[PDB]
Ligand SMILES: CC(=O)c1cccc(NC(=O)N2CCOCC2)c1
Ligand SMILES: [Cl-]
Ligand SMILES: [Cl-]
Ligand SMILES: [Cl-]
Ligand SMILES: [Cl-]
């Protein structure tokens with residue numbers, strides 16, 4: 001067991017191992033500090049969870065987040081450097097701290113203020129798809145891909161973070177908000193049981209915005225955003241209408257005048273024809289017909305970067321806990337076992 005020290009930073013007690021020095025608040029599900037890790041030489045983010053075991057819902061969310069971060073071991077995905085508690089037994093266990101690499105800029109800080117060549121767009125979207133091939137091979141859905149959840153460095157190297165932990169509220173998705181502009185229509189309006197294809201819709205929206213410098217579907221509300229989507233990709237045919245489970249959602253769609261799919265070369269003026277072709281394969285209304293991450297990596301747009309011997313898959317991931325009914329203290333015991341069994345990376 002390391003030695004811990006205590007300090008108060010902006011109204012909060014932080015109790016952390018001596019290896020972490022020069023803590024400074026960066027923001028606030030919990031509170032975050034920047035620190036220097038003397039064991040590894042890296043600058044790190046230390047997150048102190050708020051009220052991790054306050055309800056059955058909160059205790060299960062804490063377990064879910066720790067299981068997911070412990071599993072993810074890939075160059076294009078956020079990984080866990082450390083996890084700790086100052087508790088010496090289950091009986092006094094009440095606080096959880098998570099440690100990752102400190103991230104600088106996000107995709108927003110380069111798409112707003114920088115000139116991107118087609119080669120930059122190839123390399124950035126290649127890396128998102130390499131990370132997604134890995135995540136989807138474990139049967140994990142990210143559910144919240146958008147520019148603010150993608151970290152980028154000076155060498156244009158990218159990491160996926162901030163997985164959807166079943167978090168977002170109704171207030172958070174209302175009106176003129178970037179939290180909804182990247183979501184697939186079937187999850188935005190609860191059409192059907194969704195699956196991993198929702199993440200490929202989000203990659204299409206991101207790729208379009210890197211090419212044009214503008215949000216693809218900046219709706220003022222759910223209905224405005226659906227009208228922008230259907231004007232580009234066309235209204236649904238009878239085959240997709242059959243797959244929408246809500247009768248009211250089917251009746252609403254049938255109230256709209258029919259529209260054909262637009263010509264994407266006339267929308268993405270001057271783009272690489274291979275970029276236009278890949279966008280037409282991602283931005284498909286019927287989720288069964290969208291290109292997968294593994295199929296997209298082999299598309300001719302990425303010929304410069306694609307290496308089928310350097311695009312790894314994940315170890316199998318057991319999510320059977322998701323259907324399990326437990327008490328607060330049972331979820332808290334499972335979480336304690338995962339904290340004490342952690343093995344750091346090389
Ligand atoms: C490289 C690339 O594809 C690119 C670059 C800048 C802008 C656009 N397209 C638009 O801003 N449009 C055109 C017509 O529709 C409304 C506005 C495309
Ligand atoms: Cl230490
Ligand atoms: Cl990482
Ligand atoms: Cl504790
Ligand atoms: Cl964003």
Ligand SMILES: [Cl-]
Nearest residue numbers: 316317318319
């Ligand atoms: Cl597992």
Ligand SMILES: [Mg+2]
Nearest residue numbers: 148149161162
């Ligand atoms: Mg985020």
